[PDB]
Design a protein around this ligand. Structure first.
Ligand SMILES: [Cl-]
Length: 461
């Protein structure tokens, strides 16, 4: 089938209930993000095409980058991002393929594949180091907005692994400068680990939605902006952000990365794996997030042999082109395809769908529902009691949905009451399921299906 181009449906807009993203014509936008931080600095033209092809084929519709990782930044071609600080008057040179011409090419390359670029204007580190002041932030924002306002596939990202109370004046100057010119793209803030942008900027008129970073510490790794022994409960950040008024959408834009060490800095520590990657994804979305962003330790830094690695990556062991074949990267599509199968905007998180005593930590089942359907993600497989009366219908149909491979298995028809469910698979064996329950009068899911069809095709002609 033809390439799905999301912006054929119009610009991205925050939906009326303040929880999800939609296009202008009302079509849902389930954000499925990939993290390609060092793509502008490390990938050449052919590598950009290959990486974005792989992202498109794995269902990603948002790839985020560090537009600038330094002052100045340098790309693989040996081109500077700035010649005279933040003075961009003479940045374009006739017959020269410049740093910003390669940035233009990355955005056009994503556009032909139906992918939005998440533009982290400037990573937090050079800003924290005082390399961009308020005056320069205004000039940089003017340059970025005038260059990219007419490119449809852009999402502005202020910050970049930094607290909102760190160089606040600089971030506000940058955000308001872009915002004065570009009213056709959504904007947000990428915060420090274990923080949410909602803590500082929920009430900012330039912020359309919030993001948080739940990565990359394990339970009990304080060695603090969060409660002790709650590190891996990324659903807590969703709750904390949405408790703030006005209600705005939220997403985990930086959960744990596949193959990154627990706590980042010890390369001999236990690495986060595909099962953990799925757990963070479903926990964030079922808590109320509008979508999810994934990352891989080898891909985000585009590691290859002969490059120094961050956080225990090893170019000689696995390069970014090999990490594109890893399980977690290729399982995110099953989360996106599931969410797009059901009425999208009436969805709410609802732990009251789980009756009896819910489990703790990895045994905490998590539920979300519409008016006529409910979804319960159970990472461990611990038996559950589900209150089927929380959705419509005298009778309900139920299915098991395998998060690792999208396998669908019909269970049967049930009367509307508190019902026991347990999946026939190893406990804590990486056979995490979503329990799908739908009012028997609705046909979002068919009884004979062993997979979900491509839900996007409803809006692709
Ligand atoms: Cl900080």
């Amino acid at each position: 089938a033809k390439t799905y181009i999301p912006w054929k449906n119009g610009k991205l807009v925050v939906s009326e209930e303040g929880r999800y993203l939609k296009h202008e014509n009302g079509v849902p936008f389930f954000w499925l993000g990939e993290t390609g931080w060092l793509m502008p600095q490390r990938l050449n033209r052919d590598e950009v095409s290959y990486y974005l092809n792989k992202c498109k084929d794995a269902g990603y519709n948002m790839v985020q980058v560090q537009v600038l990782n330094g002052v100045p930044s340098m790309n693989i071609y040996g081109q500077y991002s700035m010649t005279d600080g933040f003075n961009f008057k003479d940045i374009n040179r006739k017959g020269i393929y410049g740093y910003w011409d390669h940035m233009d090419y990355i955005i056009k390359s994503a556009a032909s594949r139906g992918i939005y670029i998440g533009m982290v204007c400037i990573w937090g580190t050079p800003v924290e180091q005082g390399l961009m002041n308020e005056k320069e932030a205004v000039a940089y924002g003017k340059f970025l907005a005038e260059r990219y306002k007419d490119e449809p596939n852009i999402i502005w990202m202020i910050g970049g692994d930094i607290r909102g109370d760190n160089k606040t004046e600089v971030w506000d100057a940058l955000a308001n400068s872009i915002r004065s010119i570009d009213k056709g793209h959504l904007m947000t803030f990428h915060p420090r680990g274990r923080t949410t942008s909602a803590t500082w900027f929920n009430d900012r008129e330039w912020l359309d939605f919030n993001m948080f970073q739940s990565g990359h510490r394990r339970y009990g790794q304080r060695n603090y902006p969060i409660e002790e022994n709650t590190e891996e409960d990324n659903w807590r950040f969703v709750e904390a952000s949405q408790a703030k008024t006005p209600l705005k959408p939220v997403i985990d834009d930086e959960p744990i990365y596949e193959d990154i060490p627990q706590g980042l800095h010890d390369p001999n520590e236990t690495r986060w794996n595909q099962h953990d990657v799925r757990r963070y994804a479903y926990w964030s979305v079922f808590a109320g997030s509008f979508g999810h962003s994934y990352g891989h330790n080898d891909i985000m830094q585009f590691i290859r042999p002969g490059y120094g690695a961050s956080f225990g990556a090893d170019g000689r062991k696995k390069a970014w082109w090999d990490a594109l074949e890893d399980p977690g990267f290729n399982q995110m599509k099953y989360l996106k395809n599931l969410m797009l199968t059901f009425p999208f905007f009436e969805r709410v998180p609802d732990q009251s769908v789980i009756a009896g005593t819910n489990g703790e930590r990895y045994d905490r089942a998590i539920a979300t529902r519409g008016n006529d359907y409910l979804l319960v993600y159970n990472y461990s497989g611990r038996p559950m009691q589900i209150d089927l009366s929380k959705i419509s219908g005298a009778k309900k149909n139920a299915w098991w949905y395998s998060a690792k491979d999208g396998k669908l298995e019909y269970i049967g028809e049930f009367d509307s009451k508190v019902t026991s469910f347990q999946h026939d698979s190893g406990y804590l064996s990486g056979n995490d399921q979503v329990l799908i329950v739908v009012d028997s009068a609705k046909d979002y899911v068919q009884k004979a299906w062993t997979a979900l069809p491509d839900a996007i095709q409803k809006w692709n002609k």
